[model samples]
Target: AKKILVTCALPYANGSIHLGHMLEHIQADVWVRYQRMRGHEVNFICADDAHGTPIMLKAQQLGITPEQMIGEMSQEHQTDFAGFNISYDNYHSTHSEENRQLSELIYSRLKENGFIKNRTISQLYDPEKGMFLPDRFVKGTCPKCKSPDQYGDNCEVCGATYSPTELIEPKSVVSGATPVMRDSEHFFFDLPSFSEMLQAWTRSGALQEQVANKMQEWFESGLQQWDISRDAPYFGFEIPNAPGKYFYVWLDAPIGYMGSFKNLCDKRGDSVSFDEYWKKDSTAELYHFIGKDIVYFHSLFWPAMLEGSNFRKPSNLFVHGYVTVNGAKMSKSRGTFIKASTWLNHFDADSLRYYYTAKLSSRIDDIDLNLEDFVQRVNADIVNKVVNLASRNAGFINKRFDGVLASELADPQLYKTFTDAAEVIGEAWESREFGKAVREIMALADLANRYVDEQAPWVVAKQEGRDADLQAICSMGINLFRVLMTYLKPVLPKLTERAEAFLNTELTWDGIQQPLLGHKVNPFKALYNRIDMRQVEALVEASKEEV
Candidate 1:
């Protein structure tokens, strides 16, 4: 068995999770679950990115400390992910001591190598409040678009990017006091210094194909020094010597992955050093899954940070497209930006899982959750075709064949077909092509239906002198069901457990070599039902209501 370490991007702990956010978490969660079912020793780690300007501002708005606010939000995040059956081995926080240690270690190495520099830059300061404003804490009209109610980092209305100091009539979001530009010292990471190392790594295929292509394009355009530190009144890991300054959340968020792994080490009583996972090149593989918005941050700056610190660079970087509802960006004004909690009110979580898997290919393509298509596809694929096979056939075996396994084995042609389907599905999951994996498993469901229709097991049981016939037909049913269970184990663990219990078998991907035989089928149950259209409509409406 192989040991695999998987990580999902840490979500910011400033607000409630929305559907778009769940997409990334669900994708990584499913993939890790699949790998574990394949019998790999895998660890899935994630955390709340608790340190950031928005978190501080949001905490102040609620008259609470940032830690308290993050604590509440982290619980909410955990609850939502649990509802979706996300199995995270370690969900830690970026503000932990482990994270601070790792951050300082990496920072110290970079500083020692002369990669860190201090520069005086203009910052937006609120004189009336007697404090410096973090860029996100200052909101005003965008200089380029004249769009009001825009963030200092980017404009929501016109989508123009600008510095906080560039916002016209910038005011403190906390006190609504007019802010002034004041010069402050900020620490900058020498990103351009690592350009050669980044180029070499990209050309050597250290990154994924599509990611490398994008990184190459961006690097060729121009790489600039990245500001890594924020001044006082920030919610983050405070700098050691800088007194009030703190590392920006982005600068320390990736370090949380290390922090979480360290937490895992402490829990498991394992002495495995984190440096082996980071500093040692050949010992481990680093894979990162992020949304398209942060492609540059992960593909460029993150890799440079690792290179500068002599840490293990990312081996594979998978970028996914955004989640849109009804083919447009999810917007509250349009009643489409649904909270994660609201999506659970109507359909089963597995139904959403099946829908996402069907739409998610390996390529960068935004998935649109059209409410109509969700109902039609899930019902047609999972309920009518997949689960309905066992629902229709299990009864025949129970009543006529006494629920005993068949004496004779399945026919060579049919047996080969089932085995082929299993093999393909396993390979798809291994390749991180979950959409293909799901389709392959669903094909087995279609095969089961076809087998039942052609063999006419019901008719076989009714015939005289048809003991062997009945045995052959029931064996085929059991074998096909076993194949489906082996492949579907990752996506729907609980339902698959029910299937295992019904068949009185312990199923694993590697243990599918031999056919189930002479075993008593425990009981009959429907794994799923064809979804009612009204339920799906209610789900859509609930999602709309959240906005």
Candidate 2:
């Protein structure tokens, strides 16, 4: 089996997980689950990016220590992800002992290689606070566009971009005082020095075309020196040999992946070295699932950091577009920003799994889950079509005939449809085209509905003389359901379990490949109930209430 290392972006631990965050988690989780089902030695690891200025500020606002705040929020994040069925193999934190050691090691290698350089830089600092203000800790009108209420990093109004120090009249949000320009010694990673190597590597087809193109554009535009060290009073691993300096969150975030690998390797108590995975020549394929907003960090700086530290770069950076509600950005004012906990209370996680898979394609496209559209997509697709087929057929046949699959498919047309659908859906999953995979699977459901129309089991069962015809139609419908479940195992695991019970046999990808399951089955209920539209509307309305 090929070895694969999968990673989801380390979500910041400053706040609760939201629907947008879950999109990335679900995308990674679905692929990881699919890979596991396909029999691969896959390591799915993620951690909370616990070290940043935001965390420190947030902790102060809550009247708690940074450690206490991150600890509480990390647990909350884990619980929220679990509720959504985002099964991570090892959910570690960036604030671990192992991580500190590994981050220092990577930083030391970069220093030894002349990739790290020290320079004096003037940044916004609050005299009252007596500390340099990180970008998130400062706010001012955008110098370029005069956008009011903009963060120091970029203008949300005019879309003009600039650095924190470039902001006009930057004031510390912490003290609400105008920050004075102060000089500080900072370590910078010479990313521009490695632009040639970075651009060549990106064009080598290691990343997807869109991602590669975006990365190339950034590198071609002269990669800037990234400030890697933050001055004192921080909540992260301290920079070695540089007193009162801590590694910036971005600097240490990617290092968390290596730290996690080392942790997992150590826990196994194996003599394996971590270099084979991180530094070796393509021994393991590294794939990162990140949102478009963070594309530059993952595609450019991340790969440059790896290269500078003599580590193997990621094979692919799977970029996904942002998720929105009702075609608008999630806003609390409009009440469409659904939290993870809030969504789970109303519907099963699998409903979300199915919805996201259907909405997302291989292309970097944003998916919207409008309230009405969400309810209809699930009810009509899951309940009316997929679940209805099983419910209408399973109990009827449980009493009349033994649960043996028909020796021969009664309807040749339906059998051909199942075979074709299985192949198409299977190929889509294998290609990482989950949206196509879902569409192909649902296409099978459409065929099953049509099959029922052509061979009306309800009408045929009433004809006493046509008992064989009734059995044949029922058998064909159930068989189609079985095939659907096999193809859907990657997307919906619970449905696969019920499918096994209905077929009275364990399912495998190979079983999906061939139709050899002619066995006894157990009676099964509807896999999902038809969601009441009124209840869905009520839930949507209720979710609008701000806590």
Candidate 3:
């Protein structure tokens, strides 16, 4: 087993967790759980990106201090994530002492290595807000396509990139006031100096093929010196010796990964060493799961920063596309941008988790939450096909045989067929090809159900002196169900827990090596319920109300 450290991108603390946020966390959680089940020593960490202009503005609007706002939002985020069964080792905040120290240390190292420079740059400034505006804080007509209401950095309609000043009519999103060009001296990271290292890292199998090709464009355009410092009035760590300047939010956000792990080590006391996983030559593996939009930061800037700071860079980066609702971008007007709290009020978390796993693949492709397909897929595959096997066979063991399984195998070859599929499924889980794993699991479920249909256990119940034969058939069915659950334990953890209780045993990869014969089990219980269309309707209605 490998020692692995995994992290999901920190969620911004300006808002609540939505279905879009769930996509990345759920994906990372499944992979982490799978690694644990396989007996790997895994540390999974995440944090709240609490230091930013947006958080400051939001706290001001809410009539609270930024510290109080972040504290409250962190609690709410933890609650929402726990409700969805996101098992993070440490969900910390970037606004911590640990982050401040690490950010300063890294910045110092970059400066010592001659990779930090200063330049006077002009940026759009909002007079009313009394601060320079970040790219996302400004909106205007697209410079290239002339599309109205485009963000300052890029055009959504025509996918063009331009400076905020190039916008047709620049306006601040915070106050809707016209912005003017203002000059300030800012610290910049010498990104162009690390181009050779970054290009090699990008092509070294650390990124996906499509993502690698996408990085080639940036390399061709020539990497620019990244602006690392923001002016005063920003809510972040101040750059050492740079008065009235603070580290940009993106500069400190990724470092939260290291800060979180360091915090975890401190909590655990002397047993775990921070340097073992972060030293430049450490043997442990590191992985980051992030959305497609942040690929440039993670793949390019993150590694360069780590290397410059004499720390271990990430071993791999998994990038995924955005989550859309019903074939369109989630929009408040369309009432499709559902929040996590609203979802829990109307549906089971496992159903949505299962639906996402069934749709997600290793590729960086957007997944849609088609409500009709969601209802039908959950009902057909999970409720009917999977749980039905246990529902059908468990009653016979409980009532007829005192919950005792039979000693002899009814169909040894069929059981072998189920167990043999574990390796293939486990490989898929290892590679994050969860959609393929789900399809393979359903195929095995189909085989088990077909076997039950052919054996006709219900028909044998009415026959004379065939009680032992009936027990054997149902025992085989239960064992088959157990195998399928073992394969599914990573994605459907709640279902796995219920299955373990009913079988009176722990579900593990080693447990699947042999079948349980003559073992007692608890009385059967309903494992899952079918989805109702009204829940979907209620969820959408609640989302609209939130808007």
The local lDDT score (0 to 100) that residue 521 gets in candidate 3 is: 90
Question: Which segments of model 2 are wrong by more than 4 Å?
Answer: 139-171, 402-408, 513-518
User: Candidate 1 — which pairs collide?
Assistant: 278-312
Candidate 1 lDDT by residue in tens digits, 1-547: 6656788888989878888888888888778878888777777889999997778878887999988989999999999988888898889999898899989988999998999999998877888866788777889889998988887689988888878778888878878999987988888999999888778877886555776788878877899999999887788888778987889889999989888999888877888646556665546666777898888888788888888887777777777889988789887766677788887876667878778877787777898998778888988987777776667667766776788877656676776777766667878876778889877777777878888889887787778999778777766777777878778777776677778888788888766767777767876657787777788667666666755
TM-score each candidate. 0.93, 0.92, 0.94
Candidates' C-alpha lDDT: 0.80, 0.81, 0.91
CA lDDT for candidate 3:
0.91
- Model 2, residue 74: distance off in Å is 1.4
A best-first ranking of the candidates according to their lDDT comes to 3, 2, 1
- Best model number under TM-score: 3
Shift of residue 137 alpha carbon in model 1, Å:
3.6
Q: Order the candidates by TM-score, highest first.
A: 3, 1, 2
Q: Per-residue alpha-carbon lDDT of model 2 for 1-547, expressed as tens digits?
A: 8788999999889988999999999988888887887788888989888998878878988999999999998999999999877877788889888799988988898899998988998878889988888778889989887877788688998888888878887788889899888898999998887777777878787666887877766756778999999987788989988899999999899888877778887887755646667874768778888899888888778888888778888878888888988898987767678889888877778888888988887778888887787788988888888877777777667777665555666877667767766566766775679988888788889989888888878888777888667777777787777777777776777776777776777777666545534557787666677666686665567667854
lDDT by residue for model 3 over 1-547, one digit each (tens)?
A: 7899999999998889999999999999999999999999899999999998888888888999999999998999999999989999898999999899999999999999999998999888999878999889899999787899998689999999988788888889988999998999999999888899999987887688889999999899889999989997889999888898999999999999999998999888945568999999899999999998999999889999999989999999998889999999998877799999888998878888889998898889998999989999999999889898989999999999999999977999999988888889999999899999999999999999999999999999999999999999999999998899998888988888899999999999878888989999998567998987788887887889888
Which pairs of residues collide in candidate 3?
Answer: none
TM-score of candidate 2 relative to the true fold: 0.92
